[PDB]
């Protein structure tokens, strides 16, 4: 229960896996979090951060954290390229990176086919999951990225219920940017099933973490 | 081609009723926010309606109960319905398209409107008897 | 709730000349949401600045916006014949959109 200290880090970049963070992966509780709250490594990729100062709260003060990889990254994708999203929006030790804790899935080859993915929460406690939602530049990008124009991504639990649709369109340069990506979380109750079916445009969790809370 | 065609305009009664349409090509519609500014005979501009990308609606204090903004993504439309139209509605009515976005940065979700970005035409509506 | 009083209400200069523009809101307004605009006779409104001092693509150089709080400047570093319009500014605020009342660009001979 000592403090969880991220460095020059805030909240988003440690949880996010930022290879700018330490993944400080071995703590398992903490009273409470020491931030740089400012630090320009929370995303790196520019895009919205859905609910961030909800997750901040959720991580306030855990009694229990284990980081654990939900969809290993070598064999979850069989039809689908694991292996090629990185972005010189992450640049990291010299060369383009992207976050540890997710994956940016693009086409196998030519063909971009229906993905689907089931984890059941067999951990007896609340799992967070955090994924991402890629919207690129122009209509070039998206066929070289996902080959299926009309791409669809459907994430669904007991809680969550949401279809989205790629927004197309050339946004000011961020980060040398002008697509985005935009990052959601939830939390997968025990027991509950979380579908992630895709055509395209998906960044997939590749760790999640089992979480009991500090209250009182 | 990047375009915004406005219609529907005509003459109508005071008191009466019209629904304008704007019919988008060459960009993603559901990528950006619409709206609506008319600008009577030589006067300036005046904002009337806006719609977000989700489907919330803006509305100018003088027509606000008066005018309805909806959008259809899948038919690239945007629509303006108007009653209990008044002479004061009288302008040409112009069709436009924005950019609005949330960026995380520095630990804070931040709001950023980039500007009416392209512009109809115009379509001309005329009240009186 | 949010006024812009737009000065002055006409500009006379010759090709050349530098144009200063003046916007100003009746109260305290973030930079990221004022922007300006170009209406050349008979035509459409054009984007020129977005967040205050950012250019829109394809706008020349000498389209310059800058200004903080409530006092905003669009300022046109060499005239030319084509620049002849009417400049409006505009603001977001409470969910609301408002225009300056416009400046008349006149082009002298």
């Known amino acids: 229960s000592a403090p969880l200290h991220l460095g020059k880090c805030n909240i988003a970049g440690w949880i996010l896996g930022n290879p700018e963070c330490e993944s400080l992966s071995t703590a398992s509780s903490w009273s409470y979090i020491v931030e740089t709250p400012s630090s320009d490594n929370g995303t790196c990729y520019p895009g919205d951060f859905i609910d961030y100062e909800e997750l901040r709260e959720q991580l306030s003060s855990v009694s229990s954290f284990e980081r654990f990889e939900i969809f290993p990254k070598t064999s979850s994708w069989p039809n689908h390229d694991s292996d090629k999203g990185v972005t010189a929006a992450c640049p990291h030790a010299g060369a383009k990176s992207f976050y540890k804790n997710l994956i940016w899935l693009v086409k196998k080859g030519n063909s971009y086919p229906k993905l689907s993915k089931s984890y059941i929460n067999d951990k007896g406690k609340e799992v967070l999951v955090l994924w991402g939602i890629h919207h690129p530049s122009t209509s070039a990008d998206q066929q070289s990225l996902y080959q299926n124009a009309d791409a669809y991504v459907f994430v669904g639990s007991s809680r969550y219920s949401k279809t989205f649709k790629p927004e197309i369109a050339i946004r000011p340069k961020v980060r040398d940017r002008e697509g985005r990506m935009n990052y959601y979380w939830t939390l997968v109750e025990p027991g509950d099933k979380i579908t992630f079916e895709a055509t395209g445009n998906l960044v997939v969790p590749r760790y999640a973490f089992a979480m009991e809370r500090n209250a009182g | 081609e990047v375009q915004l065609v406005e219609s529907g305009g005509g003459l109508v009664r005071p008191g009466g009723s019209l629904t304008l349409t704007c019919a988008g090509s060459?960009?993603?519609?559901?990528?950006?926010?619409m709206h609506w500014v008319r600008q009577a005979a030589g006067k300036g501009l005046e904002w009337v309606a806006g719609?977000?990308?989700?489907?919330?609606?803006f509305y100018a204090g003088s027509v606000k109960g008066r005018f309805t903004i909806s959008r259809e993504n899948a038919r690239n439309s945007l629509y303006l319905q108007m009653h209990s139209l008044r002479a004061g509605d009288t302008a040409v009515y112009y069709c436009?398209?924005?950019?609005?976005?949330?960026?995380?940065?520095?630990?804070?979700?931040?709001?950023?409107?980039?500007?009416?970005?392209?512009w109809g035409q115009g379509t001309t509506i005329t009240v009186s008897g | 709730e949010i006024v812009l009083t737009q000065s002055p209400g006409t500009l006379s200069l010759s090709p050349g000349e530098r144009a200063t523009l003046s916007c100003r809101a009746s109260?305290?307004?973030?930079?990221?949401?004022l922007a300006w605009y170009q209406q050349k006779p008979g035509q459409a409104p054009r984007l020129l600045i977005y967040?205050?001092?950012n250019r829109a693509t394809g706008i020349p150089d000498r389209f310059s916006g800058s200004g903080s709080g409530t006092e905003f400047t669009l300022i046109i570093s060499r005239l030319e014949p084509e620049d002849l319009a009417v400049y409006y500014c505009?603001?977001?605020?409470?969910?609301?959109?408002?225009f300056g009342q416009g400046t008349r660009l006149e082009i002298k001979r």
């Open positions: 109260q305290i307004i973030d930079n990221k949401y």
């Open positions: 719609m977000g990308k989700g489907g919330e609606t």
């Open positions: 505009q603001q977001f605020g409470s969910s609301v959109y408002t």
């Open positions: 060459g960009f993603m519609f559901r990528s950006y926010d």
């Open positions: 436009a398209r924005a950019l609005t976005e949330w960026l995380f940065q520095r630990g804070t979700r931040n709001h950023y409107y980039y500007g009416m970005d392209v």
């Open positions: 967040g205050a001092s």
